[PDB]
């Protein structure tokens, strides 16, 4: 067991539970501390950020972050789960027009309400026969299967999800995702070269502060960071005029914790990497 800090952006295998994925990654990295930031539907594939070490302290900031999905729906069939695995409960002919489709899709854009929320972008990829493919960038708490089911009813033919992939969480680069196979291949490569697995695995991690990517970064000179790390507010130009911020110190931008602009406009410590002394 070793103390390793960072975030592994795993491309979760179809069918695997987030917990099983977490355990496998934790073991591969031999991390003493690991957790995820919200279970991804077992039937979905895609980005599952796994926080290691200190990164776990800032998991909450990813839980309430935005997400982007690619979804393929089967039109004409409503199922008893709103998805592929299961038998049909209601089948109807697909007769809606292209203009009706565009109109129905527009009702799912922007601030909307659900009862099985904000859809920043609903990208129409294609509609061919009984298949509808879309990309949805939404706020936390959004129910994708409910959007598809409701859309299916609005179109008058019904629909259910046959493909679901989370392309990204927050601003994490989709290209930085890695598969379990790739992780295993690196472990073998390391064993083969007689070098620690960590040497090839660690470069794949995103920074320990990345779970808080939705918040701006404020760098403090070491003369000011000492006060902040001791639990005291500090003034800094650049700092936003409101909200949470990721705080770093020195020339190398070492992350020291979350801060929040207080009433006076100073950067007050909210969740530090280090503990307060007695």
CA 242, 245, 247, 253 dihedral sign is negative
Residue (of 22, 183, 149, 28) closest to 80 by Cα position: 149
Own/partner contacts of 193-198, CB < 8 Å, gap of 24 or more, are 197/28, 197/30, 198/2, 198/4, 198/29, 198/30
Instruction: Report the 3 state secondary structure along the chain.
Output: CECCCEEEEEEECCCCCHHHHHHHHHHHCCECCEEECCCCCCCCEEEEEEEEHHHHHHCHHHHCCCEEEEEEEEECEEECCCECCCCEEEECCCCCCHHHHHHHHHCCCEECCCCCCEEEEEEEEEEECCEEEEEEEECCCCCHHHHHHHHHHHCCCCEEEEEEEEEEECCCCHHHCECHHHHHHHHHHHHHHCCCHHHHHHHHCECCCHHHCCCCEEEECHHHHHHHHCCCCECCCCCCCCCEEEEEECCCCEEEEEEEECCCCCEEEEEECCCCCC
**Residue 69 annotated as lining a ligand binding site:** yes
Resolution in A: 1.9
228 vs 11: CA distance, rounded Å: 37
215 is in an annotated binding site: no
CA R_g for the chain: 22
Determine if residue 166 is labeled as part of a ligand binding site.
yes
70 has binding-site annotation: no
Q: In the PDB record, what is the listed experimental method?
A: X-ray
**Cβ 191 vs Cβ 221: under 8 Å:** no
Set out the domains of the chain in order of their start, with CATH numbers. 1-213 (3.30.2350.10), 214-278 (2.30.130.10)
Distance (Å, rounded) from C-alpha 75 to C-alpha 96? 10
Beta bridge partners of residue 137, listed in sequence order: 68, 121
Q: Is 91 exposed, middle or buried (0-12, 13-18, 19+ CB in 10 A)?
A: exposed
Cα-Cα-Cα-Cα dihedral sign, residues 50, 53, 55, 60? positive
Cβ burial 218-232 (10 Å sphere, 16+ → b, else e): bbbeeebbeebbeee
What is the rounded distance in angstroms from the CA atom of residue 47 to the CA atom of residue 11?
A: 5
Residue with tokens 């001791």, as numbered in its chain: 230
Q: How far apart are CA 248 and CA 228, in angstroms?
A: 10
Asked if 114 and 127 count as a contact pair (C-beta separation under 8 A), the reply is no
Distance, in Å, from the CA atom of 141 to the CA atom of 114, rounded to the nearest integer, reads 10
Looking at the annotation, which residues are catalytic? 41
Please name which of 30, 32, 119 lies closest in space to residue 68, comparing C-alpha atoms. 119
Distance CA 113, CA 162 (A): 23
Angle at 108 between CA 165 and CA 156, to 5 degrees: 95
List gaps in the chain by the residue before each (C–N > 2.5 Å): 116
Nearest-angstrom CA–CA distance, 210 and 192: 32
Q: How far apart are CA 146 and CA 259, in angstroms?
A: 36
End-to-end CA distance of the chain: 28
């Amino acid at each position: 067991g070793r103390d390793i800090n960072g975030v592994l952006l795993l491309d979760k295998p179809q069918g695997m539970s987030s917990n099983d994925a977490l355990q496998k990654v934790k073991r591969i990295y031999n991390a003493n501390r690991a957790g995820h930031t919200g279970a991804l539907d077992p039937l979905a594939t895609g980005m599952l950020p796994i926080c290691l070490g200190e990164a776990t302290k800032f998991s909450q900031y990813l839980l309430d972050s935005d997400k982007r999905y690619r979804v393929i729906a089967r039109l004409g069939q409503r199922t008893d789960t709103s998805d592929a695995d299961g038998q049909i409960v209601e089948e109807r002919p697909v007769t809606f027009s292209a203009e009706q489709l565009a109109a129905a899709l527009d009702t799912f854009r922007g601030d909307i309400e659900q009862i099985p929320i904000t859809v920043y972008e609903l990208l129409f990829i294609r509609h061919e026969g009984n298949e509808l493919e879309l990309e949805i960038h939404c706020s936390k708490g959004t129910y994708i299967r409910t959007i598809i089911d409701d859309l299916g009813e609005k179109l008058g033919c019904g629909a259910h999800v046959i493909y679901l992939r989370r392309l990204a969480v927050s601003k994490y680069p989709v290209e930085r995702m890695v598969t379990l196979e790739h992780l295993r291949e690196l472990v073998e490569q390391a064993e083969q070269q007689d070098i620690p697995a960590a040497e090839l695995l660690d470069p794949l991690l995103m920074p320990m502060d990345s779970p808080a990517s939705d918040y701006p970064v404020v760098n403090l000179p070491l003369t000011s960071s000492v006060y902040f790390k001791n639990g005291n507010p500090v003034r800094t130009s650049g700092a936003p005029l409101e909200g949470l911020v990721r705080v770093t110190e020195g020339e190398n931008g070492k992350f020291i914790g979350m801060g929040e602009i207080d009433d006076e406009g100073r950067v007050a410590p909210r969740r530090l990497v280090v503990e307060y002394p007695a």
